[PDB]
Symmetry: D3
Subunit: 306 residues, 6 copies
Amino acid sequence: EPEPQMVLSPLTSAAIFLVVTIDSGGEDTVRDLLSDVASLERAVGFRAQPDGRLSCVTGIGSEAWDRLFSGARPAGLHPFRELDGPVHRAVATPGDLLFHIRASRLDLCFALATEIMGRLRGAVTPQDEVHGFKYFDERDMLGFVDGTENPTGAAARRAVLVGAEDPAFAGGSYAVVQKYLHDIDAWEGLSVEAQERVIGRRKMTDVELSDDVKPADSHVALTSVTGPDGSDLEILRDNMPFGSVGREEFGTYFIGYARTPEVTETMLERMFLGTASAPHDRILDFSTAVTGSLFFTPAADFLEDL
Amino acid sequence: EPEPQMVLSPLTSAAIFLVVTIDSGGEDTVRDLLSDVASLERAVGFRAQPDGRLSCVTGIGSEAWDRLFSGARPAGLHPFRELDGPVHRAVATPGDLLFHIRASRLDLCFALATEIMGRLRGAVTPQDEVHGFKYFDERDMLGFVDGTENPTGAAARRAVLVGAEDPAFAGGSYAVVQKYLHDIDAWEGLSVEAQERVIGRRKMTDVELSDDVKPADSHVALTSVTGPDGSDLEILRDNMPFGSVGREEFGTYFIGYARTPEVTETMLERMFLGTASAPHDRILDFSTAVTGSLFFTPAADFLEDL
Amino acid sequence: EPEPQMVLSPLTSAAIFLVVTIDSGGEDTVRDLLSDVASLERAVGFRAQPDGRLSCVTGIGSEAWDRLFSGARPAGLHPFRELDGPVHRAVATPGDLLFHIRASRLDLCFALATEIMGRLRGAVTPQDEVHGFKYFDERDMLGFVDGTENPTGAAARRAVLVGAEDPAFAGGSYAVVQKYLHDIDAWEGLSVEAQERVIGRRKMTDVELSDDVKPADSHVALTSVTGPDGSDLEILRDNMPFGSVGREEFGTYFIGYARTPEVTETMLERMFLGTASAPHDRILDFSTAVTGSLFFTPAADFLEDLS
Amino acid sequence: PEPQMVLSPLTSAAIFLVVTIDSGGEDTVRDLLSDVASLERAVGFRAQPDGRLSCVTGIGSEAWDRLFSGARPAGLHPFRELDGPVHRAVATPGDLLFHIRASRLDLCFALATEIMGRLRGAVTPQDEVHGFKYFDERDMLGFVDGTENPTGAAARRAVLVGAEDPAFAGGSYAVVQKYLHDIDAWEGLSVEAQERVIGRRKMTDVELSDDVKPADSHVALTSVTGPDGSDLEILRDNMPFGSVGREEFGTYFIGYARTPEVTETMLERMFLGTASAPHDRILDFSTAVTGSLFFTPAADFLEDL
Amino acid sequence: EPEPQMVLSPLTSAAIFLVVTIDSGGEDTVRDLLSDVASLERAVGFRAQPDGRLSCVTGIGSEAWDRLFSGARPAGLHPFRELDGPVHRAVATPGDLLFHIRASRLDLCFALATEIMGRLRGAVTPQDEVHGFKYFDERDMLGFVDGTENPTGAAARRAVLVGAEDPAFAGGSYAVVQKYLHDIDAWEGLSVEAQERVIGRRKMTDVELSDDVKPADSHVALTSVTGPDGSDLEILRDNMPFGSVGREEFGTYFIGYARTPEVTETMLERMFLGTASAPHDRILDFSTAVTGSLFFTPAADFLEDL
Amino acid sequence: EPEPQMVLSPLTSAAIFLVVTIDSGGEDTVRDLLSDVASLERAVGFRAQPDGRLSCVTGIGSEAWDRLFSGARPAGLHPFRELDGPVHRAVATPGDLLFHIRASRLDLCFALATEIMGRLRGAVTPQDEVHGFKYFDERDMLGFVDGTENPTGAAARRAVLVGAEDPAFAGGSYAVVQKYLHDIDAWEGLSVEAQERVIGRRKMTDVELSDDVKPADSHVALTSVTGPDGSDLEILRDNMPFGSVGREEFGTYFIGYARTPEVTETMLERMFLGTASAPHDRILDFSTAVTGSLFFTPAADFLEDL
Ligand code: HEM
Ligand code: HEM
Ligand code: HEM
Ligand code: HEM
């Protein structure tokens, strides 16, 4: 079988998100790193066995793919599609490589990132760097438990991993990243009950609102998508809080994995463009996307055979 | 193909056992809960990732099944069979629903139980509620390590999960519960060596007694059962100590999972009714069963498709 | 230099509260136990070094004291004073001995309680037994962080330990216990904002409400007491949640330590009888006291020097 | 007098927050200062036994005059800029210091949010650093950092203001400097060369013998004996920080002492050098980008506002 | 279908290595133990659930196999082959039974070893006993991170477990043990850079040296073996530091598992005898092997069916 | 005030006991180390803040003291007094320096011991080296909880630390070490009840036997000593289990601290020589002392001012 990257691994207490573009004539240096990335992961990771839980997921953008590789392309790989809604906008920003680094400790993440960037120095330009941290009982900056309804086990495997529909890239996945900044002043102006109506779940207990009470423009309502078969379309989210108190930055770093970008994009469209019953996702009234990129995260063996 | 409940999950340091009967005209409320139980489990459980280890196993009694569902019944589902032995008696007590809730912390168990009972309020009558706690190095109230010979891996899967013998209910299991109260005064009257002869294992080291020394009326001897094919008949036990010091209650809450109740019942019969070589299980001379109920724990997907 | 009991020790994740009365002619058996209690604590506790954090605080009631001991009495030792307010009542219930047992694990608590009761069997009658457990991020059954404003360090020592004002009992303390049951249905009927106005603190963040917004009948307002010298009167609280889901019991087991019972009683009076600005503590509209007892917890050396 | 948590040990997470007080912001600041310990408990109690949340509040020299009337701490003055032949220790603006520590970053961030929420519109942020533990108590140079910190009574005598200034007993002086390291240059050296810069073995953290230890090594220059012949000591709570993209690999230096003279003597030896050493060799790989001095008063001082 | 021993389990912080020879007429006692070994493992192990991580891997030597069993032999089972190189020698020493005991605590290891030896007393002669301990961030006595490049997941399973090539012993594995003593005085005489050239990896960061800088006589170079198929030949190593400061013993206890001993032996030959480009492994200039034994570790069910 | 060594620190899960004699003309090297010992402790210890709990207590023997220092001697410092009882003998063995190294991890202990011995190499001869480990719930090799009645707080300070009775050495303490080997075969021949009568406490629960049942020749009875004022004379014990399964070594490494050796010696005399009511300590019927040494552990500042 093909061996996937750690795209199915659970949420950790620390994360580093690193997005870079490949400079002119940097292809060679990048290809060398890509073949050594798993090697670097073990080099750092083994030091903190067995509680370290260091992993790195490497993603490659659409434009970057053509510059790096000859032959077949992943069927669903394309640039992030900008969504200009009536009120809210999902922007597309540059990104060739994604490094999604997770561990139970930030030091492990930072050490690995140092090794990666040390090898890439002079071949890449950094676009974005976010240091994520767990906030209390798995909460986001809005004060709600975040990640509850992530699929697990076989359900996760079927939702995330590329299969027979694109057999040359089986074991791969698609990652969509968006950096969100929150308007905390406005958010804290709402009552808890009002906030619950925005999300679609109880704040403290994380219990889902009943279908009779759950608004149609609530986050949970709009991101609940059924396919033609009537089965649920699911994504795996590894969102992390981040921020800077001085600059009044309180953020959610969104990352979602899916076997096809169509699933994530459908959810994006419902959020930004709305449905017949909802103008847009109410969460966006308190959340601004400042980045937006799409990457293909190939199977581990693909990177190694370079 | 069918996804079982957490019937194969290991012992935890905290547990809540909840047994209720369904009131007249409470069927509708119960069916609604049953479809939401896994949802409630995640809602509470996700807060304490990743060390929480919160799980809930839901069981349905024989009489309750007929009230709740139409169509096929699990082949082995029947009311708990009372055993009136010459000396000791295994009583049958009322119970329609079983909630076997486990976590590494009691708060998680209590929180989930609160949500379940909050939804069931006015539709059910509580019969029994036990808060179990780990006692030293996996000991019971008799001071012996308890659970040692539980099957693991494939052996556990084959012993616990319903398979091809009842294909419509594959992935299900049968749970037998008995609340035992111990006569500690009498037990502590025995020497350690005498106690070892009752159980069939060394007290401190938990090493099994050799076959030449192990009495025929010892607990280990009587609960060791070989089937017609010569293979060992096994059950998975999740026993928890409980008690109240003031009321002089020192208890073992027995729960055993098996793919067919015949296995558990055979062991029960040997214990209470005895064999040709043993009058009864010597453990019963220091243990009184005060409850007795049998439940079928269906596959997770069965509950969800309601 | 007198050695106090673990009355200054922090909150743990598990606790057992045990209240018993001494039967007729049980005095001798009780005195023997009291001299061995610290010994039993070590016997169980040492097994779980160093994360066990097993402790037992032993308290003796007013009536019980006279039955047990011959000489001087602690100056502030008296039976719990029942408070019959216009609406709410703080009941006084029987209790001769208090065992406040804490550890990081319930097994340690249960093991010690077993040894104590095994020695006391036939000499005492159990009045109350509560198994307390930590609830999330130090929350009570009302869903609020509970214990925030407990004094620490020197402030705790000055607030809790008997000193020169009663030198024969220096290193002792006074414990007031009340078992509260909560009306969760009524409580969950309120909005979070309304609940915050009852307590006097933000629910999720545990941040105290500003003085301009904090109601006069809020829990925090009424339990804030300044003495004649203008300094704050403080108590050390070791409250634990408890309950049974089936019987719809959601409880707070209140225990407060102070160097004099006057401090705790003042707070009690303000809660139940009210002030000029407040009828009563709004928390009592959702909380019923079902027990009430006062104990003196002597210095460790006092217990050891028996017989 | 009850001191702040200036004697508390190093934690795995820290937030350093330096702000200046805007014109007419004094009132808002004084209100916060009286509530800071209250806010610390509000957040800290949530994580009660593992959390180890603490906040040390420091006040600058210029800020002190704007905030308070009456006596000043004897040693309180603005950070003294040191213009050495080669290296420079810059002085940058800073009125308030918030040194926030915990075993988890969330606790630090939560407390910082509450503090800044109260100070919004009254202060301007100058610096914000999120510190993290790096392996076995290492700094960005790859050396164990904090080994020779005083403990127990020795720490108490070195850090806490006593009878020499009785009105401010239980207080302390904090010097902060944000350092950025030239990792490329540093990693160009052999381990042995690096050891000669620091004055200790890299892996084992064992101090070099006096026969081998260079006179311009970090350990040599920061070893100071007073007129009484006893060692002059400071308590350091240095934390690594950085951003991989911007090539920032930093040490956030913070040192507590009962008098700033001790820290300043060490600073002078580092930047200006001695007769035997031009300067501290560590500075050849380290650039100070901030420099501020604060007085951290006793806890009761803040509360009685 | 066959259940293997814990040969795939990760490194722990404590270990006991026990090598014994079977005395004349001790076969019967040994066979009885072998059938009870898993039983003894559970008896001790269950006490420290779930963080104990107690395991025991039992190995049987070539000569011992013939004395114990009739019928088929594992295809690759033979005595350890002594290697007399020009300079360095890999000695073969006596060993009939191997007990590889691991846990997160030494007490668990010692307790199990006590029970095993208690049963074997008078039937076996101890040859070697080593108490291993974790040294900082997974380091060996040479001060390098040790075990980094161990295979994981499916790769580990394919490298370690006997399969269809010997179907009667599927689920088994081959263990090679060597006790090494290090010349620390000589080693510490080298600069860090010189030490890095001996190993083939950076000392502190554990990052592998680039192929342009990595010497041909470095440890990593010589133990990197590609098969006829062009794929990498891998072994699973569970090396533990040990020693005594007074007697100047600073040791590495080498143990390597592989599906065939040919893999381990190839690496051994390259180390001791060298290649065309390298005289011998430079690590041996600072390391002396004092024991050398080869064992077959059968599937668990093989031991149980005795 | 004088700063003591970590003689009051609690028991840890790992320990190394190191006893050496000073070779001829080794005094200078030893004095240099003694001044650096605290420095070496911090160098290793700080790496594992804050759970490492690394400490080293350095002790100096009577004969060694005269060779190392001029001026005053500790009042109670003398060679270990051999006790030749009717049945059992407490031997005196050579020892000039004691290093009592403790931590929560063995690696820390081993690392520090390496540094100490590295500095002392060629100036000292090792006499004894023991690696101690925690055994279950603070048990010794006899299976009893060991250390229960150790004094704590002020009581410990008054029992252990030299005070005004010898003001020049205030903050110092006296350490007596004895390596005991146990006859486990004989011990396990006794019933639990018989073992309880030997010790004077219940085996499993660690509860002290009542005075009516406690034998006069029990360990607890003989080591209970009251001074002239009727208060108890106490010592602080840091006993650690050790052993080797192959060589049938199951040991207790006894170390006791006291402000004067008279206390420890009184207990020793009662144990070996007996009283009017007891021939000897029954524990000695199952325990053989193979070493015996007495050391003075000076205040920390004494070592530093060298
Ligand atoms: C009265 C309450 C009970 C207590 C305190 C108790 C305790 C124990 C103990 C100490 C052991 C040996 C260690 C172990 O393997 O777990 C054991 C084994 C066992 N018990 Fe029980 N038990 C009780 C009731 C039952 C009941 C009612 C059943 C059957 C329905 C049962 C089935 C077993 C089985 C199958 C074993 C494993 C025997 C073997 O294969 O070696 N137990 N029990
Ligand atoms: C450029 C950033 C700095 C780094 C990376 C750094 C690193 C270190 C290291 C690795 C040590 C040895 C281990 C230890 O005992 O902590 C040390 C010691 C020390 N450092 Fe620094 N340091 C820095 C700046 C400073 C500054 C600005 C001062 C104050 C003027 C200072 C004062 C000290 C002192 C007093 C010692 C202990 C010396 C002794 O008594 O042995 N350091 N530093
Ligand atoms: C003298 C004692 C030995 C020491 C101290 C030692 C140490 C090391 C170290 C530090 C590494 C690099 C990190 C790692 O991947 O584990 C390594 C790699 C390795 N060692 Fe050893 N080793 C020893 C003996 C052996 C022996 C006898 C074998 C085989 C029979 C062996 C096989 C390997 C293999 C296969 C690797 C991985 C190489 C790669 O694929 O990069 N080692 N060893
Ligand atoms: C032969 C090895 C020894 C073993 C296995 C051993 C074991 C024990 C045990 C199980 C206890 C009771 C629990 C406790 O309080 O710690 C105990 C108590 C004690 N032992 Fe030992 N012991 C040994 C040698 C010694 C020696 C040589 C001394 C004195 C020099 C000593 C002094 C004591 C003292 C003072 C107590 C406490 C007595 C009391 O007040 O209850 N032990 N020992």
